[PDB]
């Protein structure tokens, strides 16, 4: 009968204290975690965080919620979650998180005759992960989600990944615009505080930046402008107007390039590899113009010898600089 | 075994009036406070604020909540905090704030047999600290959090740092790319308003800005452009096209640099140390072009003498300007 299920549920909830952990004096409750990643939307370098949407399921056991005579698993309305005890799980990394709430609060309570309870939530979390952008844009980030209980120590609650390494699903399918998820790892541990030792789970992704876009847009304009700065040398040294105009316009173009990549870079105030490369190229064009300064000073007060010396040295020096840069940052 | 705790909790909250603080007519209630700084996410000079995430623990004595026969501490669910009195603390210098609420309201209540209550929250606060950016980016800032009691005067409540200087922990966890904490400080005092005298606890941090990024990105290009302006002296005096193009294009490059650091650096509308350096460099570049104009008027309308004098003066004057600048601000 349908009313029989209503009476069973009312009996289960009657005399139920939400404030008391299951087996309040007994051993700790073993909560099995499970995640299905729906999307990792943003990976913000400027904010040094990433947005992640997940179906987060928690399985545990409550003898108070055991029932008999109803063979089915009672899938109840989400509002019943208010009247039950649920674990004290929270994320440490989250700058801002929320449970999706449209048309209902996106929660599920599924009871079972054995007493085991499944509690599922659709959660979007802006987790904070540090990024070592010293080698930017050739870097290997490692962004993690940390799961812990706020109130209950390891003596009261116990966490584990349900399904072992198969606990987390969806990493294989999710694709990022600017990164590739090389690997994901599941870790379980205990962390000691002043209050006590708490359980912890950790889902750590390793992200490798895809490099087929910065070379197309960042390095090549600077390299070609430096090459034009070298083209300055092959012009005859008596044509002061032509050489000076070429050199100073190349300097202006490099300044524009630097300013607008600063506008279109992550804009984190500390030095990165791309900054070093851009300043190297800027110093190269500046030295190219100062070379003609030397040439004009010497000729009016041989000079073609200096021009040939520059012709052989500047491409070679820049090739050496490029080799050093591309070996150091690889 | 488990019900007995239920009647203990029920009789604890039976006859308990949250509207009255402990010892309503008696002496003031002492509230100790601890803070564990998870991180300082941002320090914005545009908005003159910083975002701080922390575990904020309060600790006080409530004789109405004393229980016997259960020697263990009762770590109750966060919802129990709705039925208890709490110190009504706030932060004076807040702009926008919240308590993290992913999967549970991140709060903890722990009762002790002697009536002692330990309350705990996980709070993100966008606190306001005004910054004196006259020395920017060579500046040192001081940002503070001002914990205070709103409704209860000094004769109703008393604040102190639990553990003294050890009350605040996790400053090691603070990791700002463009700042480094040189010191943190705790202060306790009283502040008088029209409604009465209230207790105040101040948590202050001194932050020193790292200037590697600024030196690399703003100072050096403006110096290289000034050197290129000096290069005009060595060229000639009759090659008017080359020298004029060099000088005016250097002026254009300085204006471009100033505009594109204005529109990319944080927007604080008043004078700063970097602005003085940039305008000094602009003045030097402008005076190089005026020097060539004077030379051209003298020659067409001794020119080599003026060129030599400018050669042995402009680098010297710029070095003097740098020495004055880099000693005033350091």
């Amino acid at each position: 009968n349908m009313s029989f299920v209503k009476e069973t549920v009312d009996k289960l909830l009657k005399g139920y204290d939400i404030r008391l952990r299951p087996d309040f004096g007994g051993p700790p409750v073993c909560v099995g975690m499970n995640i299905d990643i729906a999307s990792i939307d943003m990976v913000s370098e400027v904010n040094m965080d990433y947005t992640l949407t997940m179906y987060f399921q928690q399985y545990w056991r409550d003898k108070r919620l055991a029932y008999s005579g109803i063979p089915l698993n009672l899938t109840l309305d989400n509002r019943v979650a208010d009247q039950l005890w649920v674990p004290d799980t929270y994320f440490l990394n989250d700058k801002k998180s929320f449970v999706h709430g449209v048309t209902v609060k996106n929660r599920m309570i599924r009871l079972h005759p054995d007493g085991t309870v499944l509690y599922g939530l659709r959660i979007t979390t802006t987790a904070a992960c540090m990024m070592d952008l010293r080698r930017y844009p050739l870097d290997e980030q490692n962004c993690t989600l940390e799961i812990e209980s706020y109130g209950y120590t390891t003596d009261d609650i116990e966490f584990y990944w349900r399904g072992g390494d198969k606990a987390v699903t969806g990493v294989e399918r999710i694709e990022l615009p600017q990164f590739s998820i090389v690997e994901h790892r599941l870790v379980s541990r205990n962390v000691v505080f002043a209050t006590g030792a708490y359980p912890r789970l950790s889902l750590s992704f390793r992200l490798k930046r895809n490099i087929g876009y910065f070379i197309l847009q960042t390095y090549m304009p600077s390299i070609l402008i430096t090459i034009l700065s070298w083209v300055s040398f092959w012009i005859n040294y008596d044509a002061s107007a032509a050489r000076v105009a070429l050199g100073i316009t190349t300097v202006l173009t490099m300044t524009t390039i630097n300013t607008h990549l600063r506008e279109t870079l992550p804009k984190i105030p500390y030095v990165k590899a791309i900054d070093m490369y851009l300043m190297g190229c800027f110093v190269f064009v500046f030295l190219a113009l100062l070379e003609y300064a030397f040439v004009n000073y010497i000729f009016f007060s041989r000079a073609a010898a200096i021009d040939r010396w520059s012709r052989i040295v500047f491409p070679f020096t820049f090739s050496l600089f490029n080799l050093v840069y591309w070996l150091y940052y690889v | 075994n488990m019900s007995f705790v239920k009647e203990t909790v029920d009789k604890l909250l039976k006859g308990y009036d949250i509207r009255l603080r402990p010892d309503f007519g008696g002496p003031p209630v002492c509230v100790g406070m601890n803070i564990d700084i998870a991180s300082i996410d941002m320090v914005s000079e545009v908005n003159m604020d910083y975002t701080l995430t922390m575990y904020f623990q309060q600790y006080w004595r409530d004789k109405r909540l004393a229980y016997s026969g259960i020697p263990l501490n009762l770590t109750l669910d966060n919802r129990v905090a709705d039925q208890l009195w709490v110190p009504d603390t706030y932060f004076l210098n807040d702009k926008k704030s919240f308590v993290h609420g992913v999967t549970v309201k991140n709060r903890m209540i722990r009762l002790h047999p002697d009536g002692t209550v330990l309350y705990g929250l996980r709070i993100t606060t966008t606190a306001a600290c005004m910054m004196d950016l006259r020395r920017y980016p060579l500046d040192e800032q001081n940002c503070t959090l001002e914990i205070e009691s709103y409704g209860y005067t000094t004769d109703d409540i008393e604040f102190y740092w639990r553990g003294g200087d050890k009350a605040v922990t996790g400053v090691e966890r603070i990791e700002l790319p463009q700042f480094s904490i040189v010191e943190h400080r705790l202060v306790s005092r009283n502040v008088v308003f029209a409604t009465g005298a209230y207790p105040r606890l101040s948590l202050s941090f001194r932050l020193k800005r790292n200037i590697g990024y600024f030196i690399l990105q703003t100072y050096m290009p403006s110096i290289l452009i000034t050197i290129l302006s000096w290069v005009s002296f060595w060229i000639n005096y009759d090659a008017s096209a080359a020298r004029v193009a060099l000088g005016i294009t250097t002026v254009l490059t300085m204006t471009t640099i100033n505009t594109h650091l204005r529109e990319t650096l944080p927007k604080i509308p008043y004078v700063k140390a970097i602005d003085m350096y940039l305008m000094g460099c602009f003045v030097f570049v402008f005076l190089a072009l005026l020097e060539y104009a004077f030379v051209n008027y003298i020659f067409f309308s001794r020119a080599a003498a003026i060129d030599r004098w400018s050669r042995i003066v402009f680098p010297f004057t710029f070095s003097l300007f740098n020495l004055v600048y880099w000693l005033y601000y350091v």
Epitope: V192 | E172, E175, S180
Partner: nanobody, 105 residues
Framework: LRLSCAAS????????MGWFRQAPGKEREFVGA????????SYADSVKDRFTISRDNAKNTVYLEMNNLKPEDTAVYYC??????????????????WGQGTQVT
């Protein structure tokens, strides 16, 4: 006296370097801690002023300088590294990688 600990590898993932001490009788105790970035130092009460920990990131090293030596300082010292999210500094369990001990007397 002077002692040092050099670290290499994924230093970014483990920014905090902890110095611990162990005598033959007592267990591992906390001596000090230093951040790899910012050079912020934390000390134990007993060695708050006698010992100092400093940072040198060019060589990726942490230097423990010892002054006002007592015979009670006779012990083995351990260099360890802690993850970004691993709780308090004072607990050896939170520290993942443990260096080889150095006996001093």
């Amino acid at each position: 006296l002077r002692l040092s600990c050099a670290a290499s590898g994924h230093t970014f993932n483990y920014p905090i370097m902890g110095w611990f001490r162990q005598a033959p009788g007592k267990e591992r105790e906390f001596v000090g801690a230093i951040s790899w970035s910012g050079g912020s130092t934390s000390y134990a009460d007993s060695v708050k002023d006698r010992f100092t920990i400093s940072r040198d990131n060019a060589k990726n090293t942490v230097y423990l300088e010892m002054n006002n030596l007592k015979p009670e300082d006779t012990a083995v010292y351990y260099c360890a590294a802690k993850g970004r999210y691993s709780g308090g500094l004072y607990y050896p369990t939170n520290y993942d990688y443990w260096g080889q001990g150095t006996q001093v007397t």
